Symmetry: C3
Subunit: 666 residues, 3 copies
């Protein structure tokens, strides 16, 4: 009989337990931890944790179902290489944002900084949105982002420019943009008599001149509908220009009204920071207060290695000013990509370890935004994974993932070029006790590493808390080879199964849920990406505007009435010029031509026709113009060249010519 104390070997007791248990009946471990010399059939346990040393001296923990209140979700399913949520996730006004990079490789080729969002606490996720376009100088360089967050109602992001060839950092820019909001306000709008401007009082609006603002029911004439910020007075007040003026002062004190902001309608503010000295990557984001934030960084190109943060004390007035702070030099070797968060006046920082044979991930806290630090190192050379985290009560809750199976432990070699099932872990650390000696890494889910290339999209995620749940957004692969070694060295995502990397989210309960469940089974046709409705005629209909940028082959085509009170069908051609041409036919090239007709059929009885004959046609490059009237308006009918071509011929005579004078013969 098992003791469940986390020290006594219960392997034998649990083996007998399973043998006495009906085939496919579950053993309840009662929330206890059981020491084992081998992991048993974990699927036949509930409410059970195992402690096991795969490598002697390195105990790790393994959760059966129901031991933690949690669940894994798959959140993207796209042919791009979708990975690196690190470390960009945030929650804004009830919506969970999972930003990432969708590329074709571990590099910036075909890369768009992207996000998916959840509007239902993680149950379902949105169609991916591209946040960046391809760099103007693609394919020499392209964008990259591992640091993104919100400060005073604006999205802030460190948008890097990196080379395709080498992934070398060339530029850093701070990009920011107001977040979309709906506000229900009382008073705060004033408009002086006999002039057109109105002043809008909105505390911490976070808007700049030119940003979008929408007004409804303002009760101040002219302050209405889609508008823009004309001036900024201070952080709580701005003005707008109205189209009109009144002979009396206007004020809406005590009246309820609506505003009115937009991410989509407002431009990015882009602040070029140039080539920042001694930076390899900017990574992670911690909002400090109403004026600024910190971003993590490391330098791992030359000795000595740097790990720390950039603090932007006033990102609104001074986006180009930041303060570089480093962690103690003892912890900087063999470290990268710090995760940073700020709670109750304390800045916490956790490093990634570069290798399993050297001291790895370490934790740091600061009460002066990185000037001084208290530090500790995690045992057993934690490496290859970032450790995104949040603080809940006295605990830091951190998540990490090995990139391929059995790489987590100190001294464990990289195991690539073969399919495996990498373990994802979480751990708690009490901040009062400040001691990681006995930290317990709990394996809560396993991912797939594909093995077709050396690189892994598994892990390197990001963590957020919303209400009583914590969310770890991270990469995982599947068994579909990208055929980089094979027929797709070009890494085209749209061939075969594209790239196996996609995003996942582990949702874990971290406090009481005092409501009845919101959970549902998704049984709908997904109808947001390409919204389809069977029309009254039984034909699939897409009412959304769409862009098809890949090569298209179409069958029979009808252009419906669409434009100018639906009077006309319309096709517009872009570029410097448009070209409508005719392929060389397969079976009868001698028939190559296009018939243009003002009527419904190929018979010229249905309307006027012009037929352009191809060079392959029996009648090479012929043109036949066939109407019951040929009317040449606004210009002379001329030959292109001088004294080269004729009007008519001996076998094609015009009956006569109707003229206002004799011909001019020279």
């Amino acid at each position: 009989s098992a003791k469940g104390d986390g020290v006594t070997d219960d392997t034998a007791a649990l083996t007998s337990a399973l043998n006495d248990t009906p085939v496919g009946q579950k053993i309840n471990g009662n929330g206890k931890t059981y020491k084992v010399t081998s992991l048993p059939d974990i699927s036949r346990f509930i409410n059970t944790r195992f402690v096991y040393e795969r490598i002697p001296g390195q105990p790790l923990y393994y959760a059966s179902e129901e031991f933690v209140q949690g669940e894994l979700f798959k959140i993207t399913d796209t042919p791009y290489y979708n990975a690196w949520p690190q470390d960009k996730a945030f929650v804004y006004e009830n919506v969970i944002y999972a930003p990432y990079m969708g590329s074709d490789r571990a590099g910036v080729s075909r890369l768009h900084v992207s996000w998916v969002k959840s509007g239902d606490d993680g149950q379902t996720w949105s169609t991916p949105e591209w946040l960046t376009d391809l760099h103007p100088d693609y394919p020499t360089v392209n964008y990259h982002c591992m640091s993104m967050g919100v400060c005073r109602n604006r999205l802030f992001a460190m948008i890097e420019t990196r080379t395709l060839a080498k992934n070398a950092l060339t530029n850093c820019a701070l990009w920011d943009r107001p977040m979309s909001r709906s506000l229900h306000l009382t008073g705060g709008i004033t408009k002086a008599a006999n002039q057109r401007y109105a002043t809008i009082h909105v505390p911490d609006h976070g808007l700049f001149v030119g940003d979008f603002v929408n007004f409804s029911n303002s009760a101040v004439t002219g302050v209405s509908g889609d508008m823009t910020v004309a001036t900024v007075i201070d952080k709580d007040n701005f003005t707008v220009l109205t189209p009109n003026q009144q002979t009396s002062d206007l004020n809406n004190a005590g009246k309820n009204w609506h505003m009115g902001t937009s991410f989509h309608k407002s431009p990015w503010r882009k602040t070029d920071l140039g080539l920042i000295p001694s930076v390899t990557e900017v990574h992670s984001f911690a909002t400090i207060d109403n004026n600024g934030f910190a971003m993590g960084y490391h330098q791992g190109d030359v000795a000595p290695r740097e790990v720390g943060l950039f603090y932007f004390p006033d990102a609104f007035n001074s986006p180009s000013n930041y303060v570089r702070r480093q962690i103690p030099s003892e912890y900087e070797p063999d470290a990268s990509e710090p995760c940073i968060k700020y709670y109750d006046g304390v800045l916490y920082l956790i490093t990634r370890g570069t290798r399993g044979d050297r001291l790895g991930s370490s934790l740091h806290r600061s009460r002066d935004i990185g000037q001084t630090w208290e530090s500790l190192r995690f045992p057993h050379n934690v490496h290859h994974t970032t450790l995104p985290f949040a603080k809940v009560g006295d605990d830091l809750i951190m998540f990490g993932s090995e990139r391929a199976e059995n790489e987590w432990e100190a001294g464990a070699p990289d195991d690539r070029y073969k399919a495996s099932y990498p373990r994802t872990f979480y751990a708690r650390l009490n901040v009062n006790n400040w001691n990681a000696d006995d930290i317990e890494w709990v394996n809560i889910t396993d991912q797939i590493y594909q093995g077709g290339i050396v690189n892994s999209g598994v892990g390197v995620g990001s963590v957020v808390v919303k209400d009583n749940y914590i969310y770890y957004m991270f990469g995982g692969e599947d068994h579909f080879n990208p055929w980089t070694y094979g027929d797709n060295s070009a890494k085209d995502p749209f061939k075969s199964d594209g790239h196996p990397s996609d995003l996942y989210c582990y949702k874990m309960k971290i406090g009481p849920d005092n409501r009845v469940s919101r959970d549902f089974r998704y049984g709908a046709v997904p109808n947001r990406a390409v919204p389809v409705f069977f029309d009254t005629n039984g034909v699939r209909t897409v009412p959304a505007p769409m862009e098809f940028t890949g090569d298209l082959g179409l069958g029979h085509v009808t252009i419906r009435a669409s434009t100018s009170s639906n009077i006309r069908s319309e096709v517009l051609m872009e570029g410097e010029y448009g070209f409508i041409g005719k392929s060389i036919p397969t079976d009868n090239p001698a028939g190559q031509r296009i018939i243009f007709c003002g009527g419904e059929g190929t018979s010229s009885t249905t309307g006027a026709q012009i037929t352009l004959y191809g060079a392959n046609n029996t009648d090479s490059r012929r043109i036949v113009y066939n109407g019951d009237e040929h009317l040449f308006q606004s210009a002379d009918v001329k030959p292109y060249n001088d004294n080269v071509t004729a009007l008519g011929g001996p076998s094609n005579r015009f009956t006569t010519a109707y003229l206002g004078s004799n011909p001019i013969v020279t």
Copy 2:
């Protein structure tokens, strides 16, 4: 330890229990009800119900998981404002129908009366089908429907016309259509010698003249394939006109054959009822017998208020004949939108309460289809929700949803303009006991109210029973703002996340299931809406006909051979006229032009060309016609105006003119 008697305060015992048990342990309540002064961590309980007074003196009940044997499903996911299944759901020949309205707001703007269907007892749902088009007089008026059902194999619906400006009723029409069926029959067709009609015996066929009927293996010559109903003899007999005749009488007695009906291929029968006096909304549907049905209604625009039903005793012969029957006068104030159902000679009616500070939902039963009533009032002013229901055994099983969190209780004010989690309830009422004093509203699922606008799409649903399961189809939102106050006051569904309201279905066990589970996890690529197949050369191929009505941007386009034994590629343009034009270039505006070519390339060596130059071109509005022959057929070559334009010019001379006679001057 807790008593679980619904009367003893069990708060302290449950808190102690929760403290003493591991978080992954599901505390089993053994189906009992526990009185609490605050709701505990519900997620940690199984088979437990709580009774709690959020508002003193108003106890409500709260289900942990596995207390009711039910599950929530999401059943639509489209950008439209998808709400108001009220009260239209029905089951027909093994298929569950969930009709609704997909609009852009609480109103008729952009509205299509729609449905989704389930062919697997609610596990998965189909691509939305539009049942109505936009009204001929859109955007002044559009359709609206809250009453729909089936009577003798025909769909019947009250199709309303309402103004976009005010949502005011302008017209009521009864629309009906035969439902699609396949019948596998033996005998029943006769055809008299020397004439062409055949008589088809199908009891209660429900077809009218002109309705679609398909025949297979009839063994009666000429009764074959797609046909239509020629005459209707009576409710059990109709004729078809065949294309042929025989010399002896035909009768397929004893022979197996197939029919034959189609919703899609049959027209609506539309009966104009004008503007029915004293009606605000027609809502809910109760099939009475083989001949007719009732539809609920209320009048709430002027005083005094009316609530009742319209009975259509013989909708087949007399669709214009309806009988107005009100509920008792004292239950009409502050009431609307009655749900009606008919079971074993009893008509049941349940009202919606208009406000929480006045007597609300009431229940009524009648043994004479609404001529006389027995009535009861639900305690505590039930308001803002319809209460759709079914009868199973001795119990009415009713479902309701508050529109926003904490609105259910009597005296509870509306709580809008902030995100919340509205409670959905069900309750049983024993019809023998006929007393609602002790009714128990059980919170079984929570929805989301978004809060970006005052209106809520939550709830207002519909209920059906299929086999041993009850289904509540209803609205729910998510956290995605429609940006009505923001960049989308126009409420375009296809911008951003469109509208958050979508449909859900709660599926609850109400009787024994004598089969092994049909349950599956859905792991397929949804491939009905836009059916895609990777063809043998690895390109995504869509074989379905489609309509793309939204603005379309295309890249490189190839129009394949498609028409007249695939001899030609074809584009047809609709409207009064077609327009093919050229945008102003943004790189080189002075190059603006389109090249039309009878060959494969831009070089005129490949085929005859006509190039139309834009006004922005350096050669403003030039036309170059370039072929090896220019042949003008069927008409004179003329200038558009008289004595204004010339043939040739001083630097563009024709060599000569070949004429049958001298020029005619002037």
Copy 3:
């Protein structure tokens, strides 16, 4: 509604089926038909789960018996048609790269036959032998489903190989020898090379010659003065299913064959394929063994099961484990002896046999061997058809039962076999045929997978408005694929299970662009009739200088429909500019016959320049230049008019 009950993994005898969903971890034994006990599992009694794996408008059925696992990927091949027949049929598959949790967009493996619609393809036998897919591709008539031709099609499977050495290149010549053990490649097959360390052996190449089973040569575009050898150096290859052609071996109309069905890999050289003959008497059931499919794909030997087991039998499933070939038949009729099981240690020359009790019929019994047990799956095609003597029950909707059973091969006795009903499907009932069942079985790791058909309640309207059986009208055809995933050994890892919460974005990959508009970057083919609204053709071609539309066929046609409201306005305006106003650009307007100005053409530009040819009337001495009310001002000529 009864409170839920834990049955503690026990089996209970009952005279009526109980409220099954009331129970957890319980099995019931019940004799629906007296003397024929069957077993019924409540939730959680079996460690297993059902998945829906296709959802397309085609009639998706007949995984039988083609499923296989290759290098971590589970393949579920099937036929997507419009009926029980070869009309509109493509041999297709879906795949899982996550141990059955999620499945891929359907891929068509075959096109329509060159002689469609007289004949089309059909396949019930597919598998892998030495890194090549092998399939028996049948040609059958649309009219009668009659077999006209059998062909063996084979193709190398896509692989990525991470190797060390094996590439040698002799000096002064270009051919390089590549050493890949059991490569299974032929001349012309695709090979990709990376980091070879041998000059010229690089990128996309093809096999030039095959020396033996372990060595082949490639032709490089260069040569070196010294010998080359990458022994001790790491490099990459390099194979492709899609970029290599099929090898097609015509076997003609194989005599006495109705269907080829099922696939058993024997060794590194060959395999067996099951068959039956059931159109003429006497019936045949057995296998075809291809001992050397690589050198001699046309060489096969016919092996029948014992004669007493051939009547009333079809569609054998065959598998090969540890020197023994196992075969299980499908029964034709419930009133005659049905499914039987056979084993052979000499590839079907001699057999040991047994009969399953109670006339098992209408189902194939695909299976695998796990330890001492055969684990087999079957499905009745409609509800209550399974039992001996049970009549077919079609033309009404029902819930057919799916079963599995174990059979210990040491005991070799099926008398006490326990068929366990693990899941129920839907049979729609709109037509007599059923897509339910007829599946395929694979094992991957500690899980067994049964891939099979099931329908839903949506009528195809064959009897109704869709006798043409067009999949793209209404809900198309109800048959789609499912997969039951059952645990068959310990799982010593933490769970990989997830809830799928993503937008499915493989079939039609959509991304909201930076302008907020849905964007599809994948190349696509739309073959169904398209109706389009406002269309903009974007710059795409020749360093994006131009927008481009190319028209195929013998000729292209751009025309104008007869207008509904104003037919007197029928025309198309072609414009070099942005708007309908001629101020924006040169215009040519072609008027329809319905227009007030019937078949008028107006050419409107600030220059009309006729290049490369005379301006001529089509006919001789019939039409004029100008008219009495449309005079040209003059004619500028190099010489006086030539007048008749």
